TrEMBL record, chain C:
<feature type="binding site">
    <location>
        <position position="31"/>
    </location>
    <ligand>
        <name>chlorophyll a 1</name>
    </ligand>
</feature>
<feature type="binding site">
    <location>
        <position position="28"/>
    </location>
    <ligand>
        <name>chlorophyll a 2</name>
    </ligand>
</feature>
<keyword id="KW-0472">Membrane</keyword>
<dbReference type="GO" id="GO:0009522">
    <property type="term" value="C:photosystem I"/>
</dbReference>
<keyword id="KW-0934">Plastid</keyword>
<feature type="binding site">
    <location>
        <position position="28"/>
    </location>
    <ligand>
        <name>chlorophyll a 1</name>
    </ligand>
</feature>
<feature type="binding site">
    <location>
        <position position="31"/>
    </location>
    <ligand>
        <name>chlorophyll a 2</name>
    </ligand>
</feature>
From TrEMBL, chain E:
<feature type="binding site">
    <location>
        <position position="39"/>
    </location>
    <ligand>
        <name>chlorophyll a 8</name>
    </ligand>
</feature>
<feature type="binding site">
    <location>
        <position position="84"/>
    </location>
    <ligand>
        <name>chlorophyll a 15</name>
    </ligand>
</feature>
<feature type="binding site">
    <location>
        <position position="69"/>
    </location>
    <ligand>
        <name>all-trans-violaxanthin 2</name>
    </ligand>
</feature>
<feature type="binding site">
    <location>
        <position position="178"/>
    </location>
    <ligand>
        <name>chlorophyll a 24</name>
    </ligand>
</feature>
<feature type="binding site">
    <location>
        <position position="26"/>
    </location>
    <ligand>
        <name>all-trans-violaxanthin 1</name>
    </ligand>
</feature>
<feature type="binding site">
    <location>
        <position position="108"/>
    </location>
    <ligand>
        <name>chlorophyll a 10</name>
    </ligand>
</feature>
<feature type="binding site" description="axial binding residue">
    <location>
        <position position="108"/>
    </location>
    <ligand>
        <name>chlorophyll b 1</name>
    </ligand>
</feature>
From TrEMBL, chain F:
<keyword id="KW-0411">Iron-sulfur</keyword>
<feature type="binding site">
    <location>
        <position position="63"/>
    </location>
    <ligand>
        <name>[4Fe-4S] cluster 1</name>
    </ligand>
</feature>
<keyword id="KW-0249">Electron transport</keyword>
<dbReference type="InterPro" id="IPR017900">
    <property type="entry name" value="4Fe4S_Fe_S_CS"/>
</dbReference>
<keyword id="KW-0602">Photosynthesis</keyword>
<keyword id="KW-0560">Oxidoreductase</keyword>
<dbReference type="GO" id="GO:0009773">
    <property type="term" value="P:photosynthetic electron transport in photosystem I"/>
</dbReference>
């Protein structure tokens, strides 16, 4: 396994993101060398209406 | 007295304003008959007006040169010269009510968010829960300092920032 | 009836009952006890 | 747990545990956090213990007053009777009351924070006696009568103390709408019960129905 | 070396672990940093030592019947000459202000240029000719006496000021009112010390 | 004469390409994503600045940005 576990909650660390210092469920993780593999899903929508986004390994950290 | 203001009892313009406002009704009362309902309505307004003026004078209010009562805000002068009921005491009568509304809404928000689908609980309220909290908030200042001294009031850098 | 009570638990219906309470309370407190300004 | 203030079905959440005068009476749930429940417990005692020793000055004396043995004044006007006396002690009493209590109470405030925390050389030589067995129930203050194993005579201290706290609230309210003392108010309810009450004569409600 | 506790049972403060006059006092954490404490410990001893001399002064004028500490500079406005034990010293007001500044500036400046942290508080040599500081025990003990007595002078010189403003009476006269009628003659009965008496 | 830059976070949705009326954007293969696609902006001379491309990108923050700049006849949408 390369990254966090399925169904595990993680905290985001992108300064650009609407979900920054916020928590979301890990939907999936790809192990094929992609730059932004970690797929995360949040309950709260962003300004557009999207509730998912692919984040990186360094950009996510353990909850709270 | 203070600030060059006379009490409302001793003022002349204050009584002048009373004789004026009653003269308007007496002229208006001449048109109708004694036992009619318009007569009873105006006589009551006359009775209320006579009661409004004497009660404001009895309460140690301060009337200016214009003849209207003025209020004092500093608690020092209010307590020294016996004018506390004007501003200083109602300040605590409000804040008790205002914090009541915050302590109640804050608790309904926290408790509904501990369950599934909190969005539905806002548009479709849980009235049994809302009434429960609304009758449990009589002592909200106790819970606040309890929650402040404990540290479970504020969140700690788990909030979104922008840069 | 379960759905009727749920409709009554919506936001505007509950707000209507609140408004009649706060408004009727303030009015009747001004119907009796007319013209308060100083609190005793 | 002792019996319930409601006989029927008012389940308490955190009062099943041991405590004195536990009747399961906390609707507002102000005793959830145990740290501040520990603080409110001492408050009930200092209000309880103080209120009882206060109610005697109103009660034990006014009984002797109504009978006619002594000519002391009533509590609602005892303060204005002292300072006009020739040999009087004008109001350096508010501040000395605070300078004296401030020394004792902070010694009690620092005990709840650090129990049994009175250093060895801090006081002159009585540092040992000031240590207490528990919070609110110290040792060297009572001379006799605190060596039993069933220590809950404390329940008497609370049921008597909670009761007195109602008394002064009734004395203050009776003495603000009746205009008379507490015992004079009692002699009337006995002589004419239905006429002298909080409803009709004591203006606690706007009752004006003359028909 | 803890002399005591201002509040028995209070939590120890590690920043004051071993110093003269430690009572574990600081509740506002002033002195948490190590460098600022060396400055405060210097300021305390000098605010001390100036108060002790100034305190004995105010008593010396009144004990010997010379006058008040408050009325001492009043000769300037009237124009008469100052006095020391009624000797009629001749100097004028502009002469006092000139010699004081030049003299104390030479003194205070030489003090600041020491750069020996222990001697900035407790110098030696000329400032102690008799040699009490040679004994380390009595030196350590006498340091607590310098500091305990000094804190009395500071708090009490403030009392000479506060007592005077509310009541214009001098020092020993203001004391006599307490002894003659304590319960009646107090700061509470000034009418200015406490609002609402 | 507008500027269009696409960033590393593209995932090959093609929704930007479908939305642009003026055919500024096209898809190019790439090894960074699951879909093995990436956008491109070869012909920005025909860009107009509608920002429909930015509206369609579903990322947390946009993989496509239109930085407006100097104008022209094609950019101002002038039939005349
Ligand atoms: C330098 C500052 C200093 C300060 C700010 C305090 C502050 C405090 N100390 Mg100390 N202390 C200080 C120094 C020291 N304390 C102590 C030893 C103690 C002890 C042992 C205790 C305190 C306590 C207290 C509290 C007293 C509160 C009170 O009643 O005040 C109100 C003001 C006063 C009491 C002053 C009243 C004036 C007065 C003394 C006049 C005396 C003349 C007589 C009245 C004449 C007799 C007339 C008759 C007829 C009545 C308070 C937190 C008590 C406490 O709470 O501990 C936890 C306590 O038990 N302090 C020592 C020796 C080591 C000190 C040395 O510097
Ligand atoms: C802690 C509770 C407490 C309560 C409930 C009362 C209640 C009362 N006091 Mg006190 N007092 C209390 C404490 C104290 N009084 C005094 C000193 C006085 C005086 C000197 C007088 C009162 C008077 C009064 C009465 C009228 C209020 C007033 O000031 O009218 C204005 C009222 C029954 C007055 C009174 O007897 O009015 C008839 C009055 O003259 N009280 C002291 C310090 C000496 C107190 C200390 O705790
Ligand atoms: C708890 C003890 C207590 C007791 C024994 C009394 C007793 C009395 N009060 Mg009283 N009172 C009390 C508390 C108490 N009060 C409190 C806390 C308040 C403030 C809310 C008042 C406010 C008040 C007013 C405004 C008036 C009285 C009056 C009276 C007298 C006539 C009865 C009456 O009006 O109904 C009492 C009415 C109440 C609302 C209080 C009853 C509720 C209590 C808490 C129930 C306690 C249960 C039970 C009685 C306890 C037994 C104790 C006994 C064995 C010693 C009577 C001597 C009237 C008077 O003028 O006296 C001549 C009057 O006008 N009271
Ligand atoms: C920003 C708020 C504010 C302002 C501008 C004032 C202004 C004033 N207060 Mg006041 N006061 C305030 C808040 C304020 N108060 C609060 C919150 C309290 C506590 C309840 C008091 C309690 C108080 C008392 C007890 C007295 C005043 C007095 C006064 C007056 C004299 C100057 C003074 O305070 O002493 C100088 C202050 C230096 C710091 C002045 C009009 C005095 C007065 O009556 O004036 C004639 C007086 O005796 N005040
Ligand atoms: C009959 C016509 C009618 C009217 C006039 C309204 C009017 C309103 N609806 Mg609405 N609604 C209607 C029919 C109607 N609705 C129908 C048929 C349905 C389907 C069942 C809904 C379902 C519905 C939902 C699900 C919600 C509304 C909400 C609202 C309010 C918008 C939120 C706002 O601005 O307050 C913003 C308010 C605040 C920021 C703070 C709270 C303070 C408020 C103003 C106090 C309460 C106001 C009270 C309801 C006013 C009395 C009713 C008034 C029309 C006379 C607004 C008062 C929303 C709401 O929350 O209502 C309050 C809401 O969530 N409506
Ligand atoms: C900043 C806003 C503001 C404030 C502070 C006030 C304050 C007041 N108004 Mg006013 N008013 C306002 C806005 C405001 N008003 C506006 C916007 C209008 C036009 C809609 C009016 C129209 C108005 C009228 C027509 C009357 C008042 C009255 C009053 C007084 C009534 C007190 C009361 O309800 O009894 C006290 C009530 C309680 C203590 C119960 C509440 C506490 C609960 C039960 C707990 C009080 C001084 C009345 C009055 O007497 O004027 C002097 C009156 O006749 N106001
Ligand atoms: C200020 C006085 C005071 C204080 C601090 C307490 C404190 C306490 N009581 Mg107590 N009590 C009191 C007076 C007081 N009581 C009086 C006068 C009575 C007789 C009516 C009682 C009867 C009583 C019973 C029967 C029981 C308690 C219990 C308790 C505990 C429950 C937690 C709680 O809600 O308390 C928090 C209290 C406060 C924050 C103070 C009240 C502040 C409000 C805002 C004032 C309300 C005004 C009032 C209506 C007039 C706590 C130790 C229960 C327990 O388990 O204790 C062992 C219990 O079973 N008490
Ligand atoms: C300006 C005079 C002054 C200064 C600089 C100090 C400095 C010091 N004292 Mg000290 N002290 C003083 C006067 C002073 N004291 C007086 C008068 C007393 C007797 C009441 C004491 C009693 C005392 C004790 C009992 C202890 C100390 C201790 C200390 C040390 C640690 C605390 C600290 O860093 O405080 C830094 C403090 C300051 C820099 C002063 C700032 C003052 C601010 C601006 C407020 C001033 C206004 C204030 C709120 C009201 C004062 C007036 C009041 C009557 C209303 C430090 C060397 C402790 C220690 O370990 O010493 C070795 C200790 O245990 N002091
Ligand atoms: C060692 C300090 C000390 C001592 C022994 C005194 C002594 C005295 N003061 Mg004084 N005072 C002091 C400090 C002191 N003061 C300070 C710092 C201030 C400024 C806040 C004042 C302000 C002051 C006023 C305004 C007045 C007095 C007055 C008096 C005299 C009678 C009333 C009294 O004692 O209560 C006042 C004393 C205090 C409140 C003491 C507070 C500080 C602590 C407790 C001192 C430590 C005492 C120690 C444990 C022994 C008495 C001789 C009165 C007087 O003579 O005129 C009638 C008067 O009117 N004082
Ligand atoms: C400094 C002082 C008091 C200082 C106490 C302080 C700061 C308390 C601080 C704390 O409480 C806190 C804040 C917070 C805690 O974390 C720390 C501590 C430390 C516990 C009093 C006056 C101290 C007084 C001083 C330093 C100076 C005295 C000299 C005088 C009065 C001379 C006057 C004359 O020369 C003339 C002018 C006129 C002539 O007529 C007569 C003579 C006598 C000749
Ligand atoms: S719209 Fe954005 S995320 Fe989607 S394919 Fe185009 S560049 Fe990638």
């Amino acid at each position: 396994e390369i990254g966090p576990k399925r169904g595990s909650l993680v905290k985001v660390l992108r300064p650009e993101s609407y979900w920054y210092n916020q928590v979301g469920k890990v939907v999936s993780v790809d192990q094929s060398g992609i730059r932004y593999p970690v797929v995360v899903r949040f309950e709260n929508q962003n300004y557009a209406g999207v509730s998912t986004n692919n984040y990186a390994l360094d950009e996510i950290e353990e909850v709270k | 007295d203070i600030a060059g203001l006379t009490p409302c009892s001793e003022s002349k313009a204050y009584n002048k304003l009373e004789r004026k406002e009653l003269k308007v009704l007496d002229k208006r009362l001449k048109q109708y008959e004694p036992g009619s309902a318009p007569y009873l309505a105006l006589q009551a307004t006359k009775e209320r007006t006579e009661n409004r003026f004497k009660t404001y004078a009895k309460q140690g209010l301060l009337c200016g040169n214009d003849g209207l009562p003025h209020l004092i805000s500093d608690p020092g002068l209010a307590l020294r010269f016996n004018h506390a009921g004007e501003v200083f005491i109602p300040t605590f009568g409000f804040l008790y009510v205002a914090g009541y509304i915050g302590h109640v809404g804050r608790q309904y928000i926290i408790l509904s968010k501990e369950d599934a689908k909190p969005t539905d609980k806002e548009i479709i309220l849980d009235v049994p829960l809302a009434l429960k909290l609304a009758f449990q908030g009589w002592a909200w200042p106790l819970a606040s300092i309890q929650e402040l001294r404990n540290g479970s009031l504020l969140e700690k850098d788990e909030n979104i920032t922008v840069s | 009836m379960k759905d009727f009570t749920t409709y009554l638990s919506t936001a505007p219906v509950v707000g209507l009952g609140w408004a009649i309470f706060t408004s009727g309370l303030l009015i009747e407190i001004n119907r009796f006890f007319p013209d308060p300004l100083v609190f005793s | 747990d002792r019996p319930l203030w409601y006989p029927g079905a008012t389940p308490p959440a955190h009062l099943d545990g041991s405590m004195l005068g536990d009747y399961g009476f906390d609707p507002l749930r102000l005793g959830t956090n145990p740290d501040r429940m520990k603080w409110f417990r001492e408050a009930e005692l200092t209000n309880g213990r103080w209120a009882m020793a206060a109610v005697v000055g109103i009660l034990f004396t006014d009984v002797f007053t109504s009978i006619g043995l002594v000519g002391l004044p009533k509590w609602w006007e005892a303060g204005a009777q002292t300072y006009p006396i020739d040999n009087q002690t004008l109001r350096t009493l508010a501040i000395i009351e605070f300078l004296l209590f401030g020394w004792v109470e902070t010694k009690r405030l620092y005990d709840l924070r650090n129990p049994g925390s009175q250093g060895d050389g801090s006081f002159l030589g009585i540092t040992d006696g000031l240590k207490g067995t528990e919070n609110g129930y110290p040792g060297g203050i009572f001379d006799p009568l605190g060596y039993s194993k069933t220590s809950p005579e404390k329940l008497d201290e609370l049921q008597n103390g909670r009761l007195a706290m109602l008394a002064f609230l009734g004395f203050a309210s009776t003495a603000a709408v009746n205009g008379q003392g507490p015992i004079e108010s009692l002699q009337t309810h006995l002589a004419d019960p239905f006429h002298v009450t909080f409803a009709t004569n004591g203006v606690s409600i706007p009752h004006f129905t003359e028909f | 070396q803890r002399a005591g506790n201002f509040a028995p049972g209070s939590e120890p403060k590690e920043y004051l672990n071993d110093l003269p006059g430690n009572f574990n006092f600081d509740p506002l954490e002033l002195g948490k940093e190590k460098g600022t404490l060396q400055r405060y410990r210097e300021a305390e001893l000098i605010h001390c030592r100036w108060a002790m001399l100034g305190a004995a002064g105010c008593l010396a004028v009144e004990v010997l019947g010379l006058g008040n500490w408050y009325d001492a500079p009043l000769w300037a406005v009237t124009g008469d000459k100052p006095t020391w034990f009624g000797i009629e010293v001749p100097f004028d007001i502009a002469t006092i202000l000139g010699v004081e500044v030049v003299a104390m500036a030479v003194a205070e400046g030489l003090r600041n240029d020491n750069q020996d942290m222990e001697k900035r508080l407790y110098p030696g040599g000329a400032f102690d000719p008799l040699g009490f500081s040679k004994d380390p025990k009595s030196f350590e003990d006498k340091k607590l006496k310098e500091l305990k007595n000094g804190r009395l002078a500071m708090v009490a010189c403030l009392g000479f000021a506060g007592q005077h403003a509310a009541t214009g009476k001098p020092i020993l006269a203001a004391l006599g009112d307490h002894l003659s009628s304590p319960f009646f003659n107090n700061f509470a009965t000034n009418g200015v010390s406490v609002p609402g008496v | 004469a507008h500027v269009v830059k696409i960033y590393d976070t593209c995932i090959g949705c093609t929704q930007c390409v479908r939305a642009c009326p003026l055919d500024v954007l096209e898809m190019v293969p790439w090894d960074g994503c699951k879909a093995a696609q990436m956008a491109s902006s070869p012909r920005t001379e025909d860009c107009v600045g509608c920002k429909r491309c930015e509206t369609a990108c579903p990322t947390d923050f946009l993989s496509v940005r239109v930085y407006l700049g100097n104008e022209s006849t094609r950019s101002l949408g002038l039939a005349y």
